[PDB]
């Protein structure tokens, strides 16, 4: 400001009008340089490294996702192999899979009947993260990532659901006749295909 005023007091009047664009741009550039914030040798935290740490964390998380999915496929095949859909049973009558169920203690599937499909908890067992930072210390990106991961990857969808005859004196079916009789017919043929008249 001292230079411009001195030039103006000296009578040059050169910076009048558009010439003022030079002092104007200069003043702005000086302001940006002194407004950059803290950058040191110890205060190393900056976008170029935080992004890398963010990038490294996302990549590691996906390999854990792959491990879960690989385990989940194993459960789908196994449960279907033991409790198929009612419509597939008609062709299977000649197969050795019929009247396969046994009561001799080791067969845990005795007295269990397929009633439909739904949600179930996988065979995986998740360990809580050690040294968890407090809510104010949590980085926002990795927080929701780990948060959403636990909610969806903790259950497996579209699996065959079952009911056990060994657990209750009765099971009251409440709804319209068509639903009630429909399922019972499904229950009757499932029982009949998997268990013999001797049991």
């Amino acid at each position: 400001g001292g230079m411009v005023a001195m030039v103006f007091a000296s009578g040059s009047h050169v910076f009048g009008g558009i010439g003022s664009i030079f002092p104007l741009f200069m003043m702005v550039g000086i302001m940006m340089m002194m407004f950059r914030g803290m950058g040191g040798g110890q205060q190393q935290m900056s976008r170029p490294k935080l992004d890398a740490m963010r990038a490294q964390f996302m990549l590691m998380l996906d390999m854990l996702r792959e491990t879960a999915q690989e385990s989940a496929d194993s459960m789908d095949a196994n449960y279907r192999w033991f409790h198929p859909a009612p419509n597939t049973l008609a062709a299977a009558v000649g197969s050795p899979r019929m009247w396969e169920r046994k009561p001799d203690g080791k067969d845990l599937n005795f007295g269990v009947v397929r009633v439909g499909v739904g949600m179930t908890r996988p065979e995986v067992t998740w360990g809580e993260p050690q040294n968890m930072p407090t809510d104010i210390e949590l980085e926002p990106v990795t927080g929701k990532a780990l948060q959403e991961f636990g909610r969806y990857q903790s259950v497996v969808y579209n699996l065959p659901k079952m009911v056990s005859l060994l657990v209750e004196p009765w099971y009251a079916l409440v709804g319209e006749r068509e639903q009630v009789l429909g399922l019972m017919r499904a229950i009757i043929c499932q029982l009949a295909f998997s268990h013999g008249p001797d049991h």
Binding site: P86, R185, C189
Partner: peptide, 18 residues
């Protein structure tokens, strides 16, 4: 399952014995 499907399944099963 309908009654027809059940009877169809039932007829197929009635063919077998121990």
């Amino acid at each position: 399952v309908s009654i027809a499907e059940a009877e169809e399944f039932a007829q197929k099963l009635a063919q077998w014995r121990l």
